[PDB]
Amino acid sequence: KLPGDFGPPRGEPIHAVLTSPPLVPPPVNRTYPAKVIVELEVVEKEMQISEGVSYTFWTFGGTVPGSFIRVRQGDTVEFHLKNHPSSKMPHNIDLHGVTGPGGGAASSFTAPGHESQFTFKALNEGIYVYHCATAPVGMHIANGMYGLILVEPPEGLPKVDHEYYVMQGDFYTAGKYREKGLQPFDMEKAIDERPSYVLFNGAEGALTGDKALHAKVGETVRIFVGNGGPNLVSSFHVIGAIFDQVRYEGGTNVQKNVNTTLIPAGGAAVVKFTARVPGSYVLVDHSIFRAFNKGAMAILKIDGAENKLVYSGKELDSVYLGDRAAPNMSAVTKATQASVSGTLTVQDQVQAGRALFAGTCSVCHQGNGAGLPGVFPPLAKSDFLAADPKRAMNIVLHGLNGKIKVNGQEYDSVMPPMTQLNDDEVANILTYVLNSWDNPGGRVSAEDVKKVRAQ
Amino acid sequence: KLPGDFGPPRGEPIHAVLTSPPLVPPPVNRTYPAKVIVELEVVEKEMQISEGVSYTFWTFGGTVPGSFIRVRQGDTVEFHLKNHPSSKMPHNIDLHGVTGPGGGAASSFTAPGHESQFTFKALNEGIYVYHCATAPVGMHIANGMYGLILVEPPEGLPKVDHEYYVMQGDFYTAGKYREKGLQPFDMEKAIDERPSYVLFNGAEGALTGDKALHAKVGETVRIFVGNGGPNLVSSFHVIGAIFDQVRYEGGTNVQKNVNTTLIPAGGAAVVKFTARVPGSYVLVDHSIFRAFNKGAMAILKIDGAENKLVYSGKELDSVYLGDRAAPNMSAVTKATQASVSGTLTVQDQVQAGRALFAGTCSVCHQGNGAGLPGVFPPLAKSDFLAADPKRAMNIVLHGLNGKIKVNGQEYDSVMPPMTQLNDDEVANILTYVLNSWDNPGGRVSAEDVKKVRAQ
Amino acid sequence: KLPGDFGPPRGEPIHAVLTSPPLVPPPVNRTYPAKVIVELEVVEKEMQISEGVSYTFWTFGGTVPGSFIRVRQGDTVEFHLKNHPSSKMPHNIDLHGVTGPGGGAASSFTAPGHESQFTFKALNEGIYVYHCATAPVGMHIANGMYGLILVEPPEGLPKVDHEYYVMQGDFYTAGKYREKGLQPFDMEKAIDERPSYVLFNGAEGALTGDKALHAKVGETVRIFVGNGGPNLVSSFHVIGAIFDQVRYEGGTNVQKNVNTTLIPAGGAAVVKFTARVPGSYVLVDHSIFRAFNKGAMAILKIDGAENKLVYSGKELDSVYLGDRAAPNMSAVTKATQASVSGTLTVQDQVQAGRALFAGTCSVCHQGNGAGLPGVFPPLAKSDFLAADPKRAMNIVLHGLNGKIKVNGQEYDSVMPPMTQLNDDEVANILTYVLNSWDNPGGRVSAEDVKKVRAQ
Numbered sequence A, B, C: 001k002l003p004g005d006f007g008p009p010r011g012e013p014i015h016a017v018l019t020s021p022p023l024v025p026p027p028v029n030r031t032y033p034a035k036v037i038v039e040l041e042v043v044e045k046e047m048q049i050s051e052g053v054s055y056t057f058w059t060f061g062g063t064v065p066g067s068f069i070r071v072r073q074g075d076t077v078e079f080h081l082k083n084h085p086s087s088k089m090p091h092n093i094d095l096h097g098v099t100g101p102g103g104g105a106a107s108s109f110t111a112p113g114h115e116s117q118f119t120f121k122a123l124n125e126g127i128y129v130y131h132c133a134t135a136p137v138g139m140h141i142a143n144g145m146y147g148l149i150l151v152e153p154p155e156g157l158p159k160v161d162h163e164y165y166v167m168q169g170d171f172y173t174a175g176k177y178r179e180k181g182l183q184p185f186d187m188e189k190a191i192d193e194r195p196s197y198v199l200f201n202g203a204e205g206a207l208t209g210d211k212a213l214h215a216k217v218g219e220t221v222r223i224f225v226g227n228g229g230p231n232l233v234s235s236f237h238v239i240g241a242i243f244d245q246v247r248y249e250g251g252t253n254v255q256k257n258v259n260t261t262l263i264p265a266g267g268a269a270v271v272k273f274t275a276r277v278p279g280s281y282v283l284v285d286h287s288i289f290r291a292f293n294k295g296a297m298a299i300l301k302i303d304g305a306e307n308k309l310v311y312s313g314k315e316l317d318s319v320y321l322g323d324r325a326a327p328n329m330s331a332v333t334k335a336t337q338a339s340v341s342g343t344l345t346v347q348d349q350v351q352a353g354r355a356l357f358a359g360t361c362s363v364c365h366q367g368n369g370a371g372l373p374g375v376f377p378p379l380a381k382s383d384f385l386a387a388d389p390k391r392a393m394n395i396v397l398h399g400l401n402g403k404i405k406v407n408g409q410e411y412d413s414v415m416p417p418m419t420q421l422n423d424d425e426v427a428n429i430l431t432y433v434l435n436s437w438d439n440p441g442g443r444v445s446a447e448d449v450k451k452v453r454a455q
């Protein structure tokens, strides 16, 4: 016999209510199999992959990941795929929860302005990736065409306080990380599996700061975690806690009490978390340069009473989270726009640089620029800075070592190069520093930095 | 006590019958431990890694992966390794099912024209990789020196309708993907873990089209799946279905009802599949650029009656499978040979281009070149094509965007660049198009494309 | 209720005794929860990452991996982090066994010459990675800032004969593998996940030869295996045996009888091994170029009686282990130092070349240089070598093929290029060969090879 053998659809046809990340539809709360009509529309559109960095995403339902679909094992699903008239490419779908060739792909081929449909029975409970299946498949997936479908067990999942939807992806831009402007897809980086960004939910900061996920001490949180790839395998981890359980796809196996778990490319898991003490818990890909250098950082923020018997310490700060500690980095978006418009002010630069200074510079120089006498020199009221701003550009790009004197005190240490910062970033950071802490003001431009970098 | 403690070998010595991929030897069907004599011969030889692309493989038994070995837990295995006189390198073996230093390596060192032997007891049931263990080990493995040995449990595995043998590997050629000719091994790409091909069973198309695996609706299929590496980890997946179970090596754990499973480099699993509806099921590495851009695609084709209650849709086609939808791409091999011989005809090019057009171009332009009026312009009887074939070369290499007029209708869309196509491929595709659909004929040469690419 | 609910700390405060790799502290052997005081000091210092290759490591307790910490589930841990005054960077810690934001990171921020402390309850049994959490986090981890903490179950782990501590990491030097000198950290390679070295316990050869782990036939060995990353996932494997069991972190799941297991970046496992026959067992990352080309090789050497019924063969040798078969390669360190000092003698070169010849050249030419008549030409008393030492430099760098005559016999084979050998390595190998086996003596310098390579 086939699995999911719960008889013909009964009751009324149900129009599925889909949700945008990071939200999940309500439990189906149903004891009979139904005919479920799913309507999903492909939209190609520019969105911000990072502040001041645009990208042409290809999306299921206007978001990356695409809309979440929730059905019950044994349901008959009538799947309608529309391709918005504004699209340039044809699209289709492969849902991993489908039993049949291509997971739906041949019968869902949809040209711009058209609609397709096919029907399948959801034989297998589990959490499943869906994605586009149109040649060149890797390009479509790299552009954002993936999401999750949950096929519930007949009795439903256990009740929890919160359910969230998080999906990792690797992205391939022609430009480097945080290089501003509209960035094309880069096929060469994609084939080589060399992403410029590794993200949760389609953008840097999508789930940090004021966009964090929330829960309270004592509550349970279920996260449906996908890995759209196209190429990477996530060493998926929660900083500061453990997963009560991890279950992949529709697997019978459930792992309990683990911290780091590998999510295949194209894979998905259901994880459960119990909040014990307050603070920010960081979901990461623990291939650490992804998390800390390419954007693969999301936050679950827990509110409630401290418990000093369990953890005596403090909330996370910019030392660990860097420039994502703060609510947002909107000033960077604004400064980038002003640069494009030819209206960039000193204050635009100052506010962008303030945002970027956090972690990146403050770890050593402090958030107030005071440093630590004899160990980390001050940027506040710094004679050394004021004496030569071109030197300061070179220091950021190329580092500094050896004995120096700053504000009457000797330092003999090492500031590593920070060459991966883009010209605008260096310029804005230095303009912030120059306009703070009784420093002499003025500004550094992106062009100034470009010239120094080329020397 | 040691595992596999079933007493001394009894009965008669057994000469193992080894099989070539994708076939498996019969179940041992035996209730006593035996002395099993295994004879395996290393052969170095050129084979086609892709159409018109030769590679010097180093093989156990003339194939990649090497011959399949099947024994019973508790057997005494007398292992004979021969190195064919034509070999240039020495070789040896490490079988993961051996208990002892090197898995056999020191006692199996075999110079060209020599033979070695050693004896081991198969203490541990499971599916195991074997591979060469000769410095430089990575080179030997990269050249194809890996296979599987099954050590059955004493009672045998459960009966199934079909057993097949599939093994992934990563390959490192000096030339790029689909660049024709005899391709040397590339040590630099290998050290960097940057393969040019990622394959099942040693070649593009080894298990697609007319070389697909087969079964019928209702049947069970067991696949012994290896990952020879040397370097990659497979996000192993079956498009359009689920694995009933997955068991790694000799592990006690068995996962049931999963879709995507990570196979370590050097690892192996036994997977089981039950055929429910007809069509082509695609085994892939779901690190998707491997599957769709480097060759990591194999097919299990299921014949039988459709079941519209389970899946209403169609068989896979070139939109998803690309140029591997068709039975084979023999015309590409023939055209490449003709180029070498200096006898390349227009028709040779046309037939090669026909094969390559599928998916690559047809996804948008259609298999009949009609496109979709106002959305995808026609290649059939195309005034725009005819007006300027050099422009058409540039369009394939570099893409096209902006408003154009084709056959009296305006288009305002984007054709992405296709720069990864090789000169011969562009030339053959365009020659096919020019000689189809009332287009003006003539031909485009590889040299013509080379010149355009260099501009 | 919280896990680890064993009541308030009792008895006396315990000062934890930490161990350096590859050793482990004794079992806690305690039936009550305690207050455990842990004191760990960060030290930045140069050490040898390979012979003659220095690197500035950042360490917890002076070693890579850092000191091992062993506590009991339910303990209250008062964690003190000191940063040695000689440090240039600030540091902190994230222990995966902590419940709380950052795993301790915000409350452990410690400038050079300072100390910090925080308290946590160890709620969860398991083996856990700890690492630095200071921006830029990837740099700190890449420089060696990781280790393991074991949180025992209340009843303790089962008794074994030996417990060892092994931790993989990926490292990023500006220079290539085995290029001599003090090598800076390379941020570009790190972001691209392109390590120059992949190591166990912080150095090539850290656990090979005279630094191998030991046990006897019949004994059980537990290894606490970490993967500090920062970036790689280990296809962790024991050559020549099986793991009796593998348990990740504090997971409920235990896998039994497996050979190859994936350890996530930031992950950790407890593996168990039962020694059955004598010899050297190789722990590797089975992404094979890491193991055999980047240093990811460690040894568990088992002493005791052979059992020919289980394995008839020989101990490992340089064919498989290469230049790590021997007790050590101290001669390479000495020759490199002599080069720096301007005192390099012929004999210094000869002894370094002797060490490097093993495997690298001996696999084909034999340890005595005799080759195999008509198959592999001799280096012993070689007329061809003597006739043209510049040609011999080119042969090592660029390979050799075609018909040649050596000592009166024709060869018609292929010696692959060995271009990844550094100039000093080629020079020392050839000087060894020239000064052995009745060859004419003299020497080849690194500068000689540099010139040939540049041709």
Ligand code: HEM
Residues within 6 Å of the ligand: A360, A361, A362, A363, A364, A365, A375, A376, A377, A378, A379, A382, A384, A385, A392, A395, A396, A400, A401, A402, A403, A404, A406, A411, A412, A413, A414, A415, A416, A418, A429, A430, A433, C089
């Ligand atoms: C972040 C991009 C950042 C800025 C900006 C910055 C500036 C800076 C200047 C201008 C100097 C010169 C001396 C002065 O105090 O005016 C300087 C010197 C040092 N820095 Fe710095 N610095 C930034 C980042 C960092 C980081 C992240 C660290 C710590 C890892 C750091 C440290 C130092 C040190 C030490 C010096 C002195 C070097 C010496 O030769 O002794 N900086 N920095």
Ligand code: HEM
Residues within 6 Å of the ligand: A089, B360, B361, B362, B363, B364, B365, B375, B376, B377, B378, B379, B382, B384, B385, B392, B395, B396, B400, B401, B402, B403, B404, B406, B411, B412, B413, B414, B415, B416, B418, B429, B430, B433
């Ligand atoms: C496959 C290699 C392929 C070929 C060949 C090809 C040819 C081609 C030509 C010659 C034109 C010019 C106009 C004409 O119809 O003669 C052209 C234009 C467009 N193409 Fe194309 N094309 C190939 C592949 C693809 C693929 C895979 C797509 C869809 C993703 C595609 C689409 C288009 C579009 C759109 C245009 C018009 C661009 C515009 O400026 O409006 N082509 N193609």
Ligand code: HEM
Residues within 6 Å of the ligand: B089, C360, C361, C362, C363, C364, C365, C375, C376, C377, C378, C379, C382, C384, C385, C392, C395, C396, C400, C401, C402, C403, C404, C406, C411, C412, C413, C414, C415, C416, C418, C429, C430, C433
């Ligand atoms: C290790 C770095 C190494 C050295 C040194 C080396 C030297 C060497 C020389 C000098 C020759 C010339 C002929 C002679 O015998 O004097 C030579 C030729 C061949 N080699 Fe070699 N060789 C080194 C390594 C290796 C390895 C690892 C192999 C086997 C894979 C190998 C093989 C050969 C072969 C074969 C030849 C002859 C080539 C031919 O044209 O027939 N060498 N080697």
Ligand SMILES: [Cu+2]
Residues within 6 Å of the ligand: A058, A089, A090, A091, A092, A132, A133, A134, A140, A145
């Ligand atoms: Cu699409």
Ligand SMILES: [Cu+2]
Residues within 6 Å of the ligand: A094, A096, A129, A131, A266, B286
């Ligand atoms: Cu998929």
Ligand SMILES: [Cu+2]
Residues within 6 Å of the ligand: B058, B089, B090, B091, B092, B132, B133, B134, B140, B145
């Ligand atoms: Cu070999």
Ligand SMILES: [Cu+2]
Residues within 6 Å of the ligand: B094, B096, B129, B131, B266, C286
């Ligand atoms: Cu192996």
Ligand SMILES: [Cu+2]
Residues within 6 Å of the ligand: C058, C089, C090, C091, C092, C132, C133, C134, C140, C145
């Ligand atoms: Cu640190």
Ligand SMILES: [Cu+2]
Residues within 6 Å of the ligand: A286, C094, C096, C129, C131, C266
């Ligand atoms: Cu961590």
